[PDB]
Amino acid sequence: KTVVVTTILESPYVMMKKNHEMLEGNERYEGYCVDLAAEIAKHCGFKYKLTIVGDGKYGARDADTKIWNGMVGELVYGKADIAIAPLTITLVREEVIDFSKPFMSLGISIMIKKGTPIESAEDLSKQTEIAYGTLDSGSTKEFFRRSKIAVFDKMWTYMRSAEPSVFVRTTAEGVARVRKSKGKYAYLLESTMNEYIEQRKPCDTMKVGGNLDSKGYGIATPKGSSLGNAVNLAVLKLNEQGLLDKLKNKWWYDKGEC
Amino acid sequence: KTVVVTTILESPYVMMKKNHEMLEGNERYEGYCVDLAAEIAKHCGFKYKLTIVGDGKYGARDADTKIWNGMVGELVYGKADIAIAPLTITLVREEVIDFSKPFMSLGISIMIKKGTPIESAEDLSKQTEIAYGTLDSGSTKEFFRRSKIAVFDKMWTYMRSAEPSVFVRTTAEGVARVRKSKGKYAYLLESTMNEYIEQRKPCDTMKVGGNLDSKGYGIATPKGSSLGNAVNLAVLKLNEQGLLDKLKNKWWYDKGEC
Numbered sequence: 001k002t003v004v005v006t007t008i009l010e011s012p013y014v015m016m017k018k019n020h021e022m023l024e025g026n027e028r029y030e031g032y033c034v035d036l037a038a039e040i041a042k043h044c045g046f047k048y049k050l051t052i053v054g055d056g057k058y059g060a061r062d063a064d065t066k067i068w069n070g071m072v073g074e075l076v077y078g079k080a081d082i083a084i085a086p087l088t089i090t091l092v093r094e095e096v097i098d099f100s101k102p103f104m105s106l107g108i109s110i111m112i113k114k115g116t117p118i119e120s121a122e123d124l125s126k127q128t129e130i131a132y133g134t135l136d137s138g139s140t141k142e143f144f145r146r147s148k149i150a151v152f153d154k155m156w157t158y159m160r161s162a163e164p165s166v167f168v169r170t171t172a173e174g175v176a177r178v179r180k181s182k183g184k185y186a187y188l189l190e191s192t193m194n195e196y197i198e199q200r201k202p203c204d205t206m207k208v209g210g211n212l213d214s215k216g217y218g219i220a221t222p223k224g225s226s227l228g229n230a231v232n233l234a235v236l237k238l239n240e241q242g243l244l245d246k247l248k249n250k251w252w253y254d255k256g257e258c
Numbered sequence: 259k260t261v262v263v264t265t266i267l268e269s270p271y272v273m274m275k276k277n278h279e280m281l282e283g284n285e286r287y288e289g290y291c292v293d294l295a296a297e298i299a300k301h302c303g304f305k306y307k308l309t310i311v312g313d314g315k316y317g318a319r320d321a322d323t324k325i326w327n328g329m330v331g332e333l334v335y336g337k338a339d340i341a342i343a344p345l346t347i348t349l350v351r352e353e354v355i356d357f358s359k360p361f362m363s364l365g366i367s368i369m370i371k372k373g374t375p376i377e378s379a380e381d382l383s384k385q386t387e388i389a390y391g392t393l394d395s396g397s398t399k400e401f402f403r404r405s406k407i408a409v410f411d412k413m414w415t416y417m418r419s420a421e422p423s424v425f426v427r428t429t430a431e432g433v434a435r436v437r438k439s440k441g442k443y444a445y446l447l448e449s450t451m452n453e454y455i456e457q458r459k460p461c462d463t464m465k466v467g468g469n470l471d472s473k474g475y476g477i478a479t480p481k482g483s484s485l486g487n488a489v490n491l492a493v494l495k496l497n498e499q500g501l502l503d504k505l506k507n508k509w510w511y512d513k514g515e516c
């Protein structure tokens with residue numbers, strides 16, 4: 001009956017409300033995806049329960065145990081009925097789960113501490129003083145591990161062998177590493193997260209260069225789910241009406257601190 | 259059997275080659291979608307025949323008869339098996355045909371003759387000395403007809419009742435109208451076509467302001483098509499291989515003449 005929604009604590013998509021300990025259920029959270037979940041649920045006619053993914057990961061298949069972790073795993077093993085999060089539509093995921101059309105368009109980008117003498121991925125590749133990495137588990141890391149493009153393959157060769165590790169467990173961790181590294185660490189992450197952080201105090205980071213690729217985030221459901229069709233139609237309707245743009249403005253720029 | 263592909267003569271997606279007179283079948287054409295069709299067919303294992311949509315339209319439903327025209331109609335009534343073209347993924351279309359994940363991201367934009375005193379949608383709506391319109395039977399026209407957003411609603415009320423008509427049969431007609439209007443006509447079209455034309459002689463037009471929305475083009479198939487699943491996964495593979503970005507640079511950037 002009640003649809004179990006798996007999501008992730010990733011700002012500004014889902015965050016704990018300041019007074020969450022005094023609130024119950026869905027009311028404990030706020031964010032772009034919290035607002036989107038309420039709308040998808042109204043338009044599809046279902047009751048739901050927001051739940052934060054237990055391992056705090058997006059979703060990758062372990063080469064070895066072949067088990068899917070993160071939000072993708074929750075859907076694959078039937079622990080959740082739908083994922084409403086900044087989950088990237090990728091070929092490997094689409095093979096095991098269904099995705100609505102994109103509710104957000106984006107691409108991999110570079111985040112630097114202001115003043116870092118880096119303007120592009122080519123710049124990062126040709127040097128070694130400034131370290132750089134990605135989220136330890138996700139579509140960004142996979143983009144690099146599989147690129148057949150020279151500059152990106154060179155970047156992957158470096159990243160996968162860098163010691164100490166240049167990979168981070170969460171986006172917040174990558175952001176803090178950039179902030180505390182005096183310009184010696186650049187972070188590769190999705191343009192959406194980059195743009196958000198650029199509008200957050202202490203306003204010491206910046207998005208540089210163009211996006212490395214083009215892709216989108218989709219609402220995911222277990223392969224063959226009853227919800228897929230309606231959820232997809234809802235995403236298309238909300239985009240055409242302008243709600244998605246409204247929500248991005250609300251969470252990225254209307255409340256910007258810089 | 260041989261897959262009948264419906265497409266549209268729209269630069270730089272599908273254009274007749276220079277020496278087309280001495281050529282046959284698929285060899286008569288070139289463009290982004292011609293290359294995309296070859297890739298899709300290779301990956302999905304099918305032979306095909308490129309056919310240009312009979313009525314030269316993208317696809318809209320007649321309010322009276324409820325009959326679909328354009329490439330959409332060809333799929334709906336079984337005249338074609340798949341549409342590989344700059345066909346916009348929309349809610350009304352998604353209800354009658356299937357769309358793969360987007361192979362290209364875009365948004366509605368404004369095309370002006372160089373020097374025209376317009377910097378955005380808001381500017382067009384504020385005055386009436388400069389006429390502006392859209393393509394007939396497409397997603398752009400629907401966008402303005404179904405928009406509750408103040409500026410867009412106002413622009414639509416002007417366009418709908420405009421005399422002479424500000425609507426055009428083909429993108430080429432819209433571009434030619436802007437070029438010969440002495441700056442008295444602006445044209446609303448997708449950013450993709452806009453930026454392509456911006457880089458072509460006589461280099462007298464330009465895209466102004468940001469996109470009005472964010473959407474994508476998808477490869478479409480009739481509901482229940484045996485090809486749907488495979489073409490969708492093929493689009494995801496091409497994007498990740500970097501092939502889609504390669505074709506985009508090939509047909510837009512390289513060979514840009516301004």
Ligand SMILES: N[C@@H](Cn1oc(=O)[nH]c1=O)C(=O)O
Nearest residue numbers: 058087088138139140189190
């Ligand atoms: N949305 C990404 C997670 N992730 O966020 C980034 O910024 N990079 C990255 O891999 C995914 O779905 O795997």
Ligand SMILES: N[C@@H](Cn1oc(=O)[nH]c1=O)C(=O)O
Nearest residue numbers: 316345346396397398447448
């Ligand atoms: N891709 C559009 C056709 N069209 O091209 C534009 O530039 N505007 C417009 O409506 C469609 O699929 O209807």
Ligand SMILES: [Zn+2]
Nearest residue numbers: 039042043243
């Ligand atoms: Zn709503």
Ligand SMILES: [Zn+2]
Nearest residue numbers: 297300301501
């Ligand atoms: Zn290929």
Ligand SMILES: [Zn+2]
Nearest residue numbers: 320321322323
């Ligand atoms: Zn009629």
